[PDB]
Amino acid sequence: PQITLWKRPLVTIKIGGQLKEALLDTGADDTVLEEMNLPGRWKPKMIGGIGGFIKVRQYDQILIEICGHKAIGTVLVGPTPVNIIGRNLLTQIGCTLNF
Amino acid sequence: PQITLWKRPLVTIKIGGQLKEALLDTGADDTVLEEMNLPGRWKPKMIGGIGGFIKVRQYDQILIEICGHKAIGTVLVGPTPVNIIGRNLLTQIGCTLNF
Numbered sequence: 001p002q003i004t005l006w007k008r009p010l011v012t013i014k015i016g017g018q019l020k021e022a023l024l025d026t027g028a029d030d031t032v033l034e035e036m037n038l039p040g041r042w043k044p045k046m047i048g049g050i051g052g053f054i055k056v057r058q059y060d061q062i063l064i065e066i067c068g069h070k071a072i073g074t075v076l077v078g079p080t081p082v083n084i085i086g087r088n089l090l091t092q093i094g095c096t097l098n099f
Numbered sequence: 100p101q102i103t104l105w106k107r108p109l110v111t112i113k114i115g116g117q118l119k120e121a122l123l124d125t126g127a128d129d130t131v132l133e134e135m136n137l138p139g140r141w142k143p144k145m146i147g148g149i150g151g152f153i154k155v156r157q158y159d160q161i162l163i164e165i166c167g168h169k170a171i172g173t174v175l176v177g178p179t180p181v182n183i184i185g186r187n188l189l190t191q192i193g194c195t196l197n198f
């Protein structure tokens with residue numbers, strides 16, 4: 001579909017068996033989800049934005065479905081105020097910017 | 100144009116007559132540029148992102164040309180790690196997400 005930018009581009013995602021709302025973010029290198037209890041091994045990571053860095057848990061080869069489009073990649077979990085879908089997964093769903 | 104996301108969507112902007120590189124950022128409500136001298140009146144503000152809040156100078160009704168497309172709107176100037184073009188201006192240049 002086509003998503004205009006008058007409002008935050010929030011869409012429904014499916015991850016770890018749960019439905020969530022997430023922001024499609026061309027300004028994010030990584031995908032970062034609000035605190036949730038995913039199984040498996042993880043590695044610590046620090047990610048940086050406006051204001052500074054937060055500590056997150058890095059999970060690899062995680063399946064996320066974004067508006068019916070499936071993607072598999074690295075998913076970070078930590079104290080973000082918003083679920084963010086970053087470029088690592090947006091490329092997998094064929095998402096482009098157009099003007 | 101159509102822009103894929105395997106790299107950061109950086110573009111050249113012109114503001115205050117000066118050229119700069121900026122990130123097309125659908126995850127930002129607002130446009131935030133690195134410290135610079137801009138002509139016009141400004142008001143102090145704060146803006147928050149991942150990591151926390153920073154202090155910025157809000158300039159309203161500023162002319163800015165984004166990859167050959169003109170916009171006139173609000174620009175926040177402060178110690179952001181990257182120049183980001185947010186949805187307030189992305190909408191003015193007709194930018195959408197598509198997949």
Ligand SMILES: COC(=O)N[C@H](C(=O)N[C@@H](Cc1ccccc1)[C@@H](O)C[C@H](Cc1ccccc1)NC(=O)O[C@H]1CO[C@H]2OCC[C@H]21)C(C)(C)C
Nearest residue numbers: 027028029030048049050126127128129147148149180181
């Ligand atoms: C390599 O570094 C990255 O990829 N970092 C990513 C990152 O922070 N990306 C932001 C742009 C960016 C890139 C690189 C350095 C600094 C800033 C942006 O795309 C998403 C955030 C999300 C948000 C956070 C809090 C509250 C609401 C929304 N938005 C934002 O900060 O927006 C500001 C400006 O507008 C306002 O609206 C929202 C808040 C205000 C990562 C992976 C941490 C998400």
